[PDB]
Every structure is written in C-alpha cells, then in structure tokens.
Amino acid sequence: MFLTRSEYDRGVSTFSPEGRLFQVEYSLEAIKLGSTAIGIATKEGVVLGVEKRATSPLLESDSIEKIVEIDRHIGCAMSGLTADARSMIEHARTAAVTHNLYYDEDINVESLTQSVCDLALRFGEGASGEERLMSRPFGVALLIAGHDADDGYQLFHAEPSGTFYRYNAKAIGSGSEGAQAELLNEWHSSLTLKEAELLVLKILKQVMEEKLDENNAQLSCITKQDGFKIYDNEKTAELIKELKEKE
C-alpha cells in the first residue's frame, strides 16, 4: 500500500488496467485547445460556422481557413492542429477526385467520411491491414457537411479515434460544451436555412470572448443547387445586423 508513479498513458500502444488508450484522450484534449466550429443540418442545406481567433491584429484575417471545400457537394470545418488537418484534407480531396475518375459519379458523404476515418486509423493497423504509417494519432477533429442523392443533406463528426457519427447539430473546439448544450435545446427538424444561420451566429456570439463581427467569424453553407459556398464578409455582416435587430 504505497503511492508510486504509473506510466501507462505515454505509449499509444499501451493499455491501461481498465482497457483505455490515454493518448487518444490527450489528442481529444488537443482538439479542445482549438477554436469553435458549429454545424447544423436542415432539409434546405447544412450550415457551418467557425470562430477566427487571431493572436495579433497584424495577422491577415482573410488567411485563417478553418472551412475548406473537399468537393463541390462536400465541405469541411476543422478544429485542432492545422498540419494534421492539411494532410487529412489532401487525402479527402484525393479520394473524392479518384472516385469521380473511376465511377463517373459523386462520392457519398458517408463514404468520404469513412475514408477519412480509415486514414485517421493509421497510427495503428490499417483498415485493410496496412502497416503503421503515423507515430501518433491526429490532434484534430472534423465536421463534414455534404449532400447526396441517396441520403439528402448530412452532417458528420469525425474524430482521431477513427469513429464518425451522424449529427443533426454538432459543435467542436474550446466552446463546444456550452454550444452543444444550446444546440440540444434549440434544434428541431423544421428549421429553415436562414433560421439555421441565425442560430449558428447566436451560438457563436454566446461562446466567443471577443465581440462577434464579420472579422472574427466565418459562415458557409451547402445546398443541392448551389453546392458548397463560403459567405463573404458583407453577407455575414448583414446576417449579424439582422440577428442584433431581432434580439
């Protein structure tokens, strides 16, 4: 009966006595160190929204890219380490383009998400039995918003553990707790695209330390007709003014 140090949480291939892998937990903590991203799925499209957190005013605000296009019908928002996200985005774009080349059709949103999760599995044995490729798990989480003919509009949450979930509304990053608590109460199946955008802006304003404006926040949407588009500053400013007038 003595207190001694335990070192089961250092190796990614080491089990805890209860069967946990604590390096994955610490990667999730690294994700929580990132900025906030929110996705809301409706029947008229899916809305993504991120907070632009700038350490210095000299940083170009139009340079932070937390929202990227994987394909015309698939967009993504990232939270965590940027280089890991860059690698994952490259892989996802390659998968979509190659599927189009070989099958002459758009890839399903769930199929792309599964491919990304299979890539994330590479810190261990691969999904098809490939050898280990990474020394550590990724430290970034993804929100993948897409539209396909088979399943309509979809929103997926992808984690470094290699598991993805389908969500009606999701939040990741530093303010993910309060944002998700608000999403649990403010989401319903009959939301319109405009209402979803306003709700995303409101929840971002709630969990942001700085005052919400067009410079420190970014919005994007995906619809069946227009595809994936990131709103310019003027449209977001108009939406913020409308939300302020409503509240």
Binding site: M1, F2, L3, T4, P17
Partner: protein, 262 residues
Amino acid sequence: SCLVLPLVSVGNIPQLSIDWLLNSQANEWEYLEALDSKYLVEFVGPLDRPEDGSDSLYKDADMKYSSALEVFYNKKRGLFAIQQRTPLVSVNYLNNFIVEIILPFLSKYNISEICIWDSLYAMEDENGVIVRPQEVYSLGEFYFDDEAELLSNLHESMVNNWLHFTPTSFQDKISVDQPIFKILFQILNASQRPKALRSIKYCSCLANEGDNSLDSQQFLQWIISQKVIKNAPPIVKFVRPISWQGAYGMADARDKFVDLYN
C-alpha cells in the same frame, strides 16, 4: 531509544523493510501517533493487518483509518519507527520536513539515536560515491560527543565527508544531491536540536527497481545482523501484511481470464 526513519528511494525498499519489521514482530509493536502530513501527498486508507492472523497494531477500537505518516512504538525495546505512505510534494520542502516535523518529535520524546534507511540507484551515481561495487550495503555512523571539534566551527563541493563508513561499505562519501546530505545538514545546523540525540546512523543499500520484497527482506536481515540497533532482536518468521496480497491487483483475478490461462 532509537527512531527508525525510512526514505522514499529507489524500489521503495526502506518502506517495504518497515512493513517487514512491524508485521514480523507485531506482538512488540503498537500504533502510537500520526505525524503531520502537511508536506507529503496526503493519504487516507484502511488499517493493514499481518497475514498470519495476529492482532492489528492499531489497539484503539474506534480507529478506522490510516494516514500518510504514522509513528509506531515498541515498549519492550523502546524503539520508535516511522511509516510513510507517500513522498514529499517537492524536494524543496525536505528542509521543512526535517525541521518542522522530525526534530520536534525527537525533542518531544527525547530520542537518543536516529537510524535512517536508504537505497541508491547505481546508474545515477554522477559523483562517483560508489568505490566498492562488489559490496551491496553501506553503513555510516556519527556521534556528537566524539566529533566535538567539527560541531563547533564556522561551517570543497559536490561531495561530503562528515559520515564515517565501514571499510566494507560500498561508499566512503555522500553526494550533495542526495537527500541524506540535506537531512544531515539540517540536523547538525539546527539550533533547537534535542540534547538527548547523540548517535546518527545511516544504512543504505544498492538495488534496482521491480518486485523488491525479497530485496527489502535481505536488507532488513543485514541491518539486524550488523546490530545497528542494539535492542533489535533477530527475525525468523518474516510475516507479510495482507495489503501485499493486492500488489499484482486483485488476489483471484487470474482465474477470471479463462480465455488466456488453462
């Protein structure tokens, strides 16, 4: 009257040795007091018992919990023993722990001898204090009455020669980085050190990390055989406490995994 103080060192060998000492001679030992655990990592747990079925050292009926730092007393031999569950929160507070805890206890109980148990890891011997690697144990003795010249003085680095080690010990000098050097400096430089304290003995071993139960038993056997403590009687039975049955987890967890062992 001698007080046995273990140090949190490599392998937890001194602490385990204490578990060997109290449990093997449980008839002569009783729980005495709980010292202040201000500078330790605080500890709460049940009352340990010997495996052989002897009565618990905690004679108080209503007592139900044990603390980090506890002092046991042997009336027949008049020996105090310190049992410590957790290390110090930081090394910087070591100077406090000897001064604000150990020295007041020595003054209060008029203890005339302090024996400190310690272990050393050979791979960390940066100052080369190990001169005879073929020897496992080291013993050092210090007397205030004999060393009257050195006690009264004004006060050449990375080493200390105050202790007197036997020629068969593995070391002749101690390193300044070792905790024992700081403990000795605090004891000798103390203004309110008890006048009854006359002998400081230091028993150290060399070992490695792992299951050090047998190593601790052999260390205790060597300490007893050398008669470092005058009133310490030889141990023949060597009973373990029941807590050691949970060293590898649950006692009967091997039969749980029927898919692995058959």
